[PDB]
Amino acid sequence: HQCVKLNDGHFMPVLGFGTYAPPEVPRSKALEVTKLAIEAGFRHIDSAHLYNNEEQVGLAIRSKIADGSVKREDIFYTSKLWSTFHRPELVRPALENSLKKAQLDYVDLYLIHSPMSLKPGEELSPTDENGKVIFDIVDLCTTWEAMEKCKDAGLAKSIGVSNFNRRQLEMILNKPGLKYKPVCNQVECHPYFNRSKLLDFCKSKDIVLVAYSALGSQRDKRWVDPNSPVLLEDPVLCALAKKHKRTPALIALRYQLQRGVVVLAKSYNEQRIRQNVQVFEFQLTAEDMKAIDGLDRNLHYFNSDSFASHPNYPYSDEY
Ligand SMILES: NC(=O)c1ccc[n+]([C@@H]2O[C@H](COP(=O)([O-])OP(=O)(O)OC[C@H]3O[C@@H](n4cnc5c(N)ncnc54)[C@H](OP(=O)(O)O)[C@@H]3O)[C@@H](O)[C@H]2O)c1
């Protein structure tokens, strides 16, 4: 039920539903599970142009409004601007396209999906002759100004960023004539990779940190190494789950809630969808919090070696 106030006065529910599924999953599933999520109690829904599901997610939202379960104001819907659309003149069209797809008049939140700009076009992964992804050089402050214009039109209630580091955050925050600060920064965050200092910074700036892969990634072999430790098989998370008679997933979500993190959870399983909302029914102890704090290993699940040579590549390599 609980929300946090954003720095523009709008409110964001602290538990959000992740809608991404791989291309093999039929598009119909995004409709079904998003309705299940709303029925379960989720009020924050996370989607993106990249996810090729905005039609289905939007239709689930419209369906739960039209059947009386919720009103539009109950739902917090997020879309994201894809990296081929960073040039300013492309920002508002991209948003409008997402809205046309989702059959919504506005999103509650529009994010720059990633700082790593790609060659402009309606090709989402532009590639050269060698199969290498073509980059683009774009001043993300011009992107941000186009985002601000989207907010002023009422097309996006709030605007923010995703996958930005300290420096890209400040470059937005330092922008001349800046009208709206980013309400949030959505990044990978879980007990293996807690982002404690990025988190402190955001709290300092009245920016909400939003955790994705908070259950440990869906572990797509295309982008995730299967040797990596499975987050939900962690001995300490499992121990705490037995202690509280909850599940490792529930422990991992509560961990973020108690450290002031808004947290996403993807599930396309009806039972797990309904289990994840129980995160509001219990508390971890300060000692449990410490034991989970101790799990931090700066572990990135997503491997983006292909993107390491990008000027805005967000996690600087050990190089
Ligand atoms: N900004 C970005 O670049 C970015 C990147 C990645 C993701 N995201 C967003 O964040 C969302 C969540 O991240 P994610 O897709 O990596 O997955 P996640 O939330 O880390 O969940 C990973 C897996 O955990 C399983 N799971 C869910 N609830 C569970 C429970 N109670 N017990 C045990 N297992 C459970 C799910 O499988 P089942 O479906 O089988 O339950 C899911 O595949 C995405 O869907 C997307 O909305 C954003």
Residues 6+ apart with CB under 8 A from 233: 248
Task: Name the burial class of residue 147, with classes exposed (0-12), middle (13-18) and buried (19+) by CB atoms within 10 angstroms of its CB.
Answer: buried
SS3 109: strand
Residue from 29, 46, 79, 213 to probe ligand 1 pocket by mutation (most atoms less than 8 Å from CB): 213
Dist. CA 301 → ligand 1 center (Å): 12
Q: What are the beta bridge partners of residue 77?
A: 45
Q: CA 211, 215, 216, 217 torsion: positive or negative?
A: negative
Amino acid 42 reads F
Half-sphere exposure of 73 (CA within 13 A, CB side): 1
> How far is it, in rounded angstroms, from Cα 71 to Cα 304?
39
Q: What is the distance between the alpha carbons of residues 188 and 298, in angstroms, rounded to a whole number? A: 11
Q: How many CB atoms lie within 10 A of CB 283?
A: 12
The structure tokens listed for 171 are 């470059």
Q: What share of the chain is helix, strand, coil (3-state, %, to 5)?
A: 40, 15, 45
Q: Where are the beta strands (DSSP E) in 27-141?
A: 44-46, 76-81, 107-112
Q: Which amino acid is at 214?
A: A
115, 141 contact by CB (below 8 A): no
CB 92 within 8 A of CB 149: yes
Q: Which residues contact 95 (CB under 8 A, 6 or more apart)?
A: 79, 81, 107, 110, 150, 155, 156
Cα angle 40, 43, 46 (rounded to 5 degrees) comes to 105
Residue 272's domain comprises 1-319
Indicate which atom in ligand 1 lies nearest the CA of residue 248.
32
Task: Look at residue 108 and give its three-state secondary structure.
Answer: strand
Cβ-in-10-Å burial (0-12, 13-18, 19+) of 149 comes to middle
The per-residue DSSP string of 139-195 comes to -HHHHHHHHHHHHHTTSEEEEEEES--HHHHHHHHT-TT--S--SEEEEE-BTTB--
The count of structural domains within the chain is 1
Q: Which of 47, 110, 215 to mutate to test the pocket of ligand 1 (most atoms within 8 A of CB)?
A: 215
Nearest CA to ligand 1 atom 37: 267
How was this one solved?
X-ray
Q: Which sequence positions are flagged as catalytic?
A: 51
| Closest residue to atom 34 of ligand 1, CA basis | 249
> Do 78 and 44 touch, CB atoms closer than 8 A?
yes
